[model samples]
Target chain A: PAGFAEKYIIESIWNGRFPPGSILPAERELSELIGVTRTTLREVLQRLARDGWLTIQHGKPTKVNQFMETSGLHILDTLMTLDVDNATNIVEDLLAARTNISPIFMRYAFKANKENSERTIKNVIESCEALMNAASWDDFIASSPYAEKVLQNVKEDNEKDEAKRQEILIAKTFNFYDYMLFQRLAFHSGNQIYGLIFNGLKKLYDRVGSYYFSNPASRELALKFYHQLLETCESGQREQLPVVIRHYGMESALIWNEMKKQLPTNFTEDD
Target chain B: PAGFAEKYIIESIWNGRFPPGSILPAERELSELIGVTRTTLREVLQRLARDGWLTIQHGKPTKVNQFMETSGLHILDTLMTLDVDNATNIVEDLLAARTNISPIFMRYAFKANKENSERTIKNVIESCEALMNAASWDDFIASSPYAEKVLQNVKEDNEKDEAKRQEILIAKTFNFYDYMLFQRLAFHSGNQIYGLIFNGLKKLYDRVGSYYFSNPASRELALKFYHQLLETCESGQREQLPVVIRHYGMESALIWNEMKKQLPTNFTEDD
Candidate 1:
């Protein structure tokens, strides 16, 4: 299928078989090498060029791009789907980027749609507080099909381990709520770019966010941060909003650093 | 050519021939409509899907995406290339996004590569000061092959209009220097995402920036803002950096609003 040819070229580029700046072989030779017909190979090349994997010109050879310099958010999405060490670096950069832009977008959301923004934050806080008060995973899972589905396998294995079950509950639920919160805020901000970036990184954010909130202390800290955020939004304290948001970001970074130490060596292995 | 088919589909979507979330016609019908073979149509669809224009599944019909919600920087880049009222909104959003992120990236650049960052900014300030002192466009363009080449077409027609020539010189020169400064800063920030977004918007930035700095007052104000930025960088006052940056943003927004009033209706027409 065409998808396989596309995947093969992407893997080849990732592995330095067709390193950045190098031209691919002639279409006849490349098709033979990949065991695809010339038409199929041409189709794959055009798609790759559109996605910034290669630069194609009418008269010149197609040059494999230095994609890190030229690619768009699509490249990041593609990288997240891969299992290479590069994905780790991308995850780190994405986290740092989130810290930088979240406050700005959040502030825009408040300015653009104050009523919805306040309501969204209030709802988040109320739900999170309820989760904090839950005495058991079952108590939290009872109301959430999403949480229940996420924890189905883990619950079967760790039914008696309340601490482990609670960790899973907090991690999965926190990811779901946090993503919903930001997605709504991004929408309210009236900035399509913000929403696009947020959506593009949603998968990576989900994976990392699940682990990020797995720590009991991290979960508590996030709850506290949400309260502070809600207060800032309600008070309309524009200057203080970034201050509060960045503080949370700084604290989260510390927790993430600690969590990184315990991460499985093959962390990129898909769930 | 496949590129024509791709362009045709993009234009069709932009014109609402196939609105967001609408299912595309079947391959046989679509290929006939676009005057391409089914294989070529499939290739175009795959490319569009990868670029966030559609969602294609094996058995299900392909759905056109609400691209503003699902797309990446590629869509923004594509929109900037089109002549549509939507391009105006994208341009405004891009400028606002730049204002929001510039300070954060600049701070990160200083932290990640202080020496290079300092050198880059210093060079910018020095070059800009030299441009400010130029008595004629010729004086400024003498040393810059880039500047000379950019003004070649304008010079052929406006050789006798010194004021008009200086305006183009200032606008083109400022855009060039400002872009170089931020591109360097984005690179030193160690964030590939920043670089990708910046590069993706480079063309739109150039178009708007040329008009932005054409006003004599805007050029002077920008010089003053740069001095403040350089001082903030030198003093290592992280808190004051965003304050200064946002002040400039506010000022630039005013200039842009005024410029928009004077802009031609067909401003999106290619240079």
Candidate 2:
């Protein structure tokens, strides 16, 4: 949804993930990548820039918004409405979830040091470096054909199974990327309790989401969660990060268990 | 908090507990009785009148809300925020505590039929009738009388031990009033899920409040809870229905051991 793009971009900028003085890609590029029209793409970007979700200067490229507004329940309502047939009280469930997960965010944010950021950034940077060093060979760039750094950890792995896939899905299900962003925002927003509350809420949300989705709202909510998720990761042009880093974790977890269930393992891959 | 009187009155009226065309006490009489200024009291009644929370003519009288305008959050937040701490995310703890007690809310709400409501109203009304039938009227009733229903419960169970009294206060803590009001509103809102989420949230909040209050912001938050409870239930008020019903349940649960102890059952009376 356009609102997902707007909220994510604003959230990113609010945390200085997109510092202040940078240019984002053109809407045309986004449309080509996302397989959407230039018009639909422009709608997403234009609205964001207008709402201070992004900043647009004449010569300079459009950039993410910095410390954008409080979001004033508008985005919350939008993301909330994306789920049709939603059990109405999910609003309250969401608040509690927001609060619970907030603390974990602080736990991680405080744990986040220059090293952590560096590790993360370096992983991505190294991926690019490997791509460049691949002789500009398009096929070799994406394919894990060799023991290159880009493909170093990208292999299907020593283990593979649906259990791992499900694990990846569940881990990603909490949408750790957003959790990280929310933590960063809480710290940046300078609201310690808000952070705590947010973390606490995320826990309850995870609890409720699992329970709620398992029940009557399963398929519909699952679709909404993924859709909101896809928009967010895509906007940063880092759509694959979720699958690579976050989803990889889930894949491993799910696979190890599934392999243990099906294939006899000499080594305890689960360990 | 201004939304409290309106919703409570409306819910009571609809259940036929308050009945139509009831002659409410005069402004000064109700104000002094509830320990709120005539202004604060009128504002709630006025809102009720506006939303059909009740019928009111300029100088004649105010009535219950025959129908509800906005059902869920607006009404719940209004009542929950009776404690200033719970105005926003601060109110999460209340929802969290309620969350713990939520399954109970759902299990009971479904079974909360006319008998429960009748028992509740009857106990409350009995307390009212008891006050009229008291032998030593001027002694405690005149000396340092509790509010109407509260005094009646206290006197009816003259053998009510310190432990029993404390348990009532604990189980029916000030936040308990908000919890009840929200539950009633959940029914009035005609949405079961609105009711369910509150339970989940209440459980989470109680956990957090217990943890934090035992640690970081204990005294201050505890004081807020206490003061809000004390002020809201000062003498006699219809809004005290939850406490009246809840307190007796606590006593029976302890003595009979019927309740599984899933919900809290402790307090320090007169604190």
Candidate 3:
């Protein structure tokens, strides 16, 4: 899709692969570089220009727009909601399908929004509160990794009581806490994209539930693994879907790491 | 321009002007119908499809999508972050230009989420509680509409004190209760679009605070009018915005209506 491709191009610019004000290869040049035909290539470029990252006219080379017009929260908002065609232009599929709005995206977005809206990230905290009190630990485990109280309790129980460990595990299943945080974070960021991210992730999660990992334990480990993946994603840890697929792959290192290896060249070992 | 025209077409469909499932004229037909070129017509049709309103496979005749796909919450999410071409897409233009994430959209979404999560719509009552204890109409007004509460008292005050109207106006300035609810309602059926919508509104509201309504009264009227709007919108009196605006224009209208003429049509009016 145009948005999917545009996302890849934008991120390249975001990470310095394409510097601001530098002219991009013509759509035709990019068409050849990306190996797509004119129709798709134009779609990607059109998405970028619409996003304010690239300024283009009928016959001119598309150059990055000024930083005043393109950078900071504005870009983040644009990145959050670039539509089907535009989002593809950035990171090549960060936006989930409309029919499959996965909860995972919401979780990721919630974490980001929480970090961004530091002062008001409370609704999400409260949702986590629900998770701890949830009937099942499996749901909570799927959603939360940083609930201090829950995490502390889990650490203490894992080696002490198998029954308690299993019960705690059951509580983490779908991660109500994750959703709570996502909703809270979205509200705090006051960016609806955060909510949509959550919706998309929920839809995606429900669509592919159990398709990625084995039992709850492996899923838990994978989540532990993804927490760092996101940290790396933010710290410029190479881009991959470890966090995206935490629902099913949280327990398996092989699966999670392999998934990371499949991302585009730009998101390589550097982030 | 196409987005504006599409909004027009949706209205035509709703007040019984364009019956359900009726085919939108052929591309050439719309050239005459809406006075745009075939390319623009095609783009508009494609957008309608993306919004879950119409279907236009390249070869097949263009027609409505039966509102068959759920177009509520997720649709809103999609609109907020779906990656549409900004040059051609008006909403994207407004959103991309924004700087800080909007608090208005965030406040509303929280209220919406609170409504969905809480069985009794307790959030509204809590808002009333805050206002009841507030020091002045300003404190009550200020606290009343902060997402966690409703502005019932503000509405009542609008009826009671012409002098207090100035302070009540403050509630509207920091307020976005209407759009938030409009969005919430739309997403109930399709949030894919709502998520995109919330982010865009937030971004747009945050940046330029100048690009917003021209004056404070405009803001006041929108929020205060929203006091009445939720009633009609819920009862499916979907055509109320235009009707209300017609009766009250400029400053008064802005105080009540948020400078908007109609609610988001894709899922809102139809639902």
Candidate 4:
């Protein structure tokens, strides 16, 4: 119930119903309007204040703070869930941030644990190659027995098409391993803050990555990039690390821009 | 209050009383233990879960998460408050992170708003010069009438010594403007995530900066560094920006290591 109340107030603030610097109404009035008791409202208000959503004073009404300017990384979760027109822009900002920090952390990982970093990249490349080969060699369109039986009532041609689509979806799931690769690299970087920031970006990465890997061309390019990174890491050429990351970021931005159009307006855990 | 209960639970986790993946006790038992009503306890639990401290499943007990690997920037506020032995390590980690990202954000700021960036640097240099001159020229130790009157009962020589110390404190306050300069640059960088991260770092900056500016030698070095940065910015030499930032970071680390010993084990807002 309190979660509901917290979400309601967050949405209200995001929608500008309670703009920055504006004071909330009296506790009694706000509690009545929100259909919660005064005690519950007070607790909710304190939580919001802790998160930098509101500024509570001894006698004055609670003032709405500028969440974008004041709130910490937790605000990203709420931002991702809001049904705003600038959803793509939010995704782009996150991508830009990650791109900027990736090279720095990658270099740290190499300096701290070069062997582990090279091995992780190698593993990522091998996994991607295996997925590519599996998608390629299964030209006949593999399907589970239950799926084939359910589609048995349909036309034979339509069943084959559904099986191929299912195969593509399964292939796309290979992108899931990319998250593990980054997480592993962050762990090796020996920087706690980098790990924390990367962890906060999980939701954004999950949604964007699924769409990114859905395209065959994009997936192939990613595998190739990983291969190049692995080769560079193995060579012990530290200077080329940033150069490689920069080149990949520039190339990926073009593809990401094109894919943004297909992304949904709001992202939820299920979505 | 909910905030009290939340703090108590967080401290319990930090002290390893309730650790990662451990199941929390029943709601009734927890509420009784914390001396809060069940409803208030539920609100606090949900807030903690939202912030990545716990996992709540409908049919199971709440599980504590590995916060270092799961929580976002909001956890930083709690970490700063906890009385941990690794307080200096936390400060060092923050300094390292800022050093890593400052160059990236500075480049963005220069690319997007070269004119504004140059002007900002010029203004910072001018302000630092003015503060330095004020501190140097007022060797007689200027003091407010109330302060002088309060020290009238002391020996005349001691009064002058106390005035000198007060003057040094006032001069140290000038370092406050350095935060504004960085904030302005982050704003112009056109990176929302950078701004959010910098905002989250306000507490750490405030605590560390006070000590950093307290040293006369450190203050002189900072002003000289600012002058160098302003000259480089005015020259429109984009390539040198990162070099300048990196050099400053390397030099400042020596001074910061010396000052960290004087920092308290725990940092509260009042401190």
- Listed per model, the TM-scores of chain A against the true chain A are 0.78, 0.24, 0.35, 0.77
Assess every candidate by TM-score. 0.76, 0.23, 0.32, 0.79
Residue-level lDDT of model 3, residues A95-202, one tens digit each, is 222212333333444355535533323434344344547665555555655554445223334447766556434434334334343344443333444443444344
Worst lDDT 10-window in candidate 3 chain B: B262-271
Tens-place lDDT per residue, model 2, B1-271, is: 4345544555456456666546656778766754665665765565444333455566556644322221222233333323333333434334333333323332333343434433333333333334334454333245333454334223323425755443333322322333334444334233333343443244333333322222212323333333333333333343553564455334422332322223232211111
* Model 2 C-alpha lDDT versus the unseen true structure: 0.38
What value of lDDT does candidate 3 attain over all alpha carbons?
0.43
Stretches > 4 Å off in candidate 2? A1-271, B1-271
Candidate 4 per-residue lDDT over residues A1-271, each given as its tens digit: 6767778888888778988858777888888886987888888778778787887767556788865656765566567678655667767777788778887788888888889988888767765666566644233225322233223211124335766655444333455557657777876788777777766676667666756777777777778778776777677788887888878888888888887777643234412
Candidate 4 chain B, run of 10 with poorest lDDT = B146-155
Using DockQ as the measure, the top candidate is 4
In candidate 3, position B65 carries an lDDT of 47
DockQ of structure 1: 0.51
Interface RMSD for model 3 amounts to 11.6
TM-score of 4: 0.79
Structural similarity of chain A in candidate 2, as TM-score: 0.24
Alpha-carbon shift of residue A78 in model 4 (angstroms) = 3.0
lDDT of 1 by residue, B1-271 (tens): 7777888888889788999968889888888896988887887777777677887767778888775655665566577667655766886787788788888788988777778888878877777778878776667667764563345323333447767656765777777777767777787788877877776666677777777777877878778877887787788899998888889888888888788777744356433
* Runs off by more than 4 Å, candidate 4: A80-83, A118-175, A265-271, B118-176, B265-271
